[PDB]
């Protein structure tokens, strides 16, 4: 399965309380949800959405909260509002999906007590089927689909054209490595869409928010995620040159992520042919005109990468890794604060096609 | 509201998952009941309510952490699947695992069988409340959970009442005021459970219940294994009082929120609720009936069940001294458990949700 969930407690080092960026994405996304419900959720006279049956909502890659709760409440409230305009009130059933090793204990223990929906947790890779056919009316996936199901094996192979020596991700400049990652993304995202097309009802909506490439931009390294990753690699190599880890440990380490362009996403979706694209765009993120926060960014990265870094390098690498990291962020403060593209959060609104619609 | 006392989490040698073999035997014995219930009472053929275009939805109420809940759910899926095949249908299955919010769903999820043929979801919440949309469950299951009350009866906590449960932590059956208080709480809780389930289960849907109870013809709960295990847990606590390790008031004020009903107790609540018919009822033949009493495993079984509620009231420093004494007392009562106790205390029900 090759699963890497986020740091799962409720304390200072947990995802719950180092996921403020991904929350701003949700906050700006509320408008996206509301507009998609009002313009594209066809409730009226439509037995697919018969309010005598429950309205079922699923979050794919929900993590441990609070972001997933804000997102789900946004959807429940927008949908409940439209039904109200039709003098109906269905029950809501909300499903929280993540990897089997996600901390569902923490999630369940922090469910809003005030909630007006029934809740369930659904353990399993969203690159597989996790629901019966035709059961989901509204699907949501925010900041999860850039995670691949695995590192492309050819970049781990010393003898491959695509061997990713001396780096932990891609920048856009090495043709063979980028091709390997993009190839893996095509397969994973197609598997996601295939599973969702079976699970989502005809006319059902799916909203996706994903770290991507800003339009026109060809170099992932000129995004914020891209430079952060590049510096993580250079920070690891400094631990190498000090002798604290060997060079093989870094050569063999790679991030299982791809950050697609809008054109990349559109290609896979159109080929899959089960969803219509109702809208694509970018999310203006709320913290955009604040100054770059060197310290807090270094913490957000650690809370994301801790497990995968530990599992490969061991616990004892973290504290000295990220003190080097923070240092490299500071030397690059200008770039992060005034040069890098702020607009790399992409969103898509999809609608599941009818069975007689090609 | 909710006073939740889940079983010991994790998957190590002290966990519920490694110390719940007796509860597994109950499910193993009930497999025959499920098969017969499906074959004779689940009206699949040409019934729009069980339209295999939709999934067949199964819920386990009080599932804990595995593996017992997986065995029960596999048994239900296999029997229902078999019957559908005889009608040349092949529905998908959606299996819901319900327990308290503080249950260890992490352990449960991480130990789900890889080769299952059902979609799975965990549902956190007290089963004395609604936890599913109305009219959505086709088959409900509940094994060794419904003897857990929503709370201790207030009467037995009241120093002014003859029901005040001084120097004891449960009932043996000789104290009529205490027994009446627990039975009262049980009618209220079990009624609330049936009410919520009637809203959730489809017309003709089944509910299968296994519960520790009062054996046929028996009046004294202390004549069951559970009853004697509780009696001796009380006396072990009073030994800690005597040794100055806990004060007497802490035992006086502590009580187990449990009631172990007779069949007649169960029938009375079900008849008054009036939403289910009793299709089958009886006592299970437990597969461990003829094995020798195991002192160490039984002590560990009880700790796995009780550690949370004991810790909340007495503090964790009490646990090891308490179960050192408990183990000694189980050993002193070896022959009673081995040969004298009634072992026919596993009751079952097959209920079917009524029309109108
Ligand atoms: C000590 C009892 C335990 C019970 O013990 C069993 O109770 C049955 C019924 O009396 C006996 O036959 C058997 O010997 C004994 O192991 O096993 C399962 C319980 C639970 O799941 O909460 C608890 C309930 C009660 O706390
Ligand atoms: N294949 C997969 N199946 C299920 N969850 C996955 C997954 N790949 C990544 N994830 C999950 O996606 C989450 C990304 S963190 C994002 C969490 C949340 N949606 C938010 O907006 O803040 C993690 O919890 C991770 O475990
Ligand atoms: N009100 C309630 N709501 C949900 N679960 C409850 C409950 N009261 C007790 N339980 C759960 O019921 C379980 C009883 S132990 C039985 C576990 C499992 N059915 C088996 O056969 O082994 C515990 O996990 C306990 O937490």
From Swiss-Prot, chain B:
Changing residue 22 to A: Abolished activity. Pathway: Alkaloid biosynthesis. GO terms for molecular function: loganate O-methyltransferase activity; metal ion binding. Optimum pH is 7.5. Disruption phenotype: Large increases in loganic acid accumulation. The keyword Lipid biosynthesis does not apply. Expressed in leaves (especially in leaf epidermis), flowers, siliques and stems, and, at low levels, in hairy roots. It comes from the Eukaryota. It catalyses: loganate + S-adenosyl-L-methionine = loganin + S-adenosyl-L-homocysteine. One of its GO terms (biological process) is methylation. Changing residue 147 to A: Abolished activity. Binds 1 Mg(2+) ion per subunit. Mg(2+) binds at residues 165, 252, 254-255. Its EC number is 2.1.1.50. Loganate binds at residues 22-23, 147-148, 226, 230, 258, 301. Strongly repressed by loganin and slightly by S-adenosyl-L-homocysteine. Belongs to the methyltransferase superfamily. Type-7 methyltransferase family. Component of the seco-iridoid and derivatives monoterpenoid indole alkaloids (MIAs, e.g. vinblastine and ajmalicine) biosynthesis pathway. Catalyzes the methylation of loganic acid (6S,7R) to produce loganin. Weak activity with secologanic acid as substrate. Inactive on deoxyloganic, dehydrologanic, epiloganic and loganetic acid. This is Loganic acid O-methyltransferase. It comes from Catharanthus roseus (Madagascar periwinkle).
């Amino acid at each position: 399965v090759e699963a890497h969930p986020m740091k799962g407690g409720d304390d200072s080092h947990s995802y719950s309380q180092n996921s403020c960026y991904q929350k701003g994405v949700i906050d700006a996304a509320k408008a996206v949800i509301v507009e998609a419900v009002n313009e594209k959720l066809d409730l009226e006279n439509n037995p697919i959405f018969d309010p005598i049956k429950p309205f079922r909502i699923a979050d794919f890659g929900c993590s441990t909260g609070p972001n997933t709760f804000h997102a789900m409440q946004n959807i429940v409230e927008s949908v409940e509002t439209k039904y109200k305009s039709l003098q109906k009130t269905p029950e809501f059933h909300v499903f929280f999906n993540d990897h089997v090793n996600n901390d569902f204990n923490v999630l369940f223990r922090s469910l809003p007590p005030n909630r007006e929906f029934f809740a369930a947790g659904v353990p399993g890779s969203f690159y597989t089927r996790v629901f019966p056919k035709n059961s989901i009316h509204f699907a949501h996936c925010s900041y999860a689909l850039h995670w691949l199901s695995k590192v492309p094996k050819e970049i781990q192979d010393k003898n491959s054209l695509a061997y990713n020596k001396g780096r932990i991700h891609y920048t856009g400049t090495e043709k063979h490595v980028v091709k390997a990652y993009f190839g893996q993304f095509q397969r994973d995202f197609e598997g996601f869409l295939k599973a969702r097309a079976q699970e989502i009802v005809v006319g059902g909506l799916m909203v996706i928010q994903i770290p991507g490439l800003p339009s026109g931009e060809v170099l992932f390294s000129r995004t914020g995620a891209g430079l952060l990753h590049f510096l993580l690699g250079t920070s690891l190599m400094e631990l190498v040159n000090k002798g604290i880890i060997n060079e093989e440990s870094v050569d063999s380490f790679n991030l299982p992520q791809y950050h697609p362009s809008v054109e990349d996403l559109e290609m896979v979706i159109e080929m899959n042919d089960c969803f219509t694209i109702e809208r694509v765009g970018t999310l203006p993120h709320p913290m955009k005109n604040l100054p770059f926060d060197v310290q807090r960014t270094s913490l957000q990265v650690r809370a994301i990468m801790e497990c995968i870094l530990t599992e490969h390098f061991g616990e004892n690498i973290l504290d000295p890794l990220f003190e080097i990291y923070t240092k490299n962020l500071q030397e690059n403060f200008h770039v992060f604060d005034k040069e890098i593209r702020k607009d790399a959060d992409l969103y898509l609104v999809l609608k599941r096609k009818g069975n007689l619609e090609h």
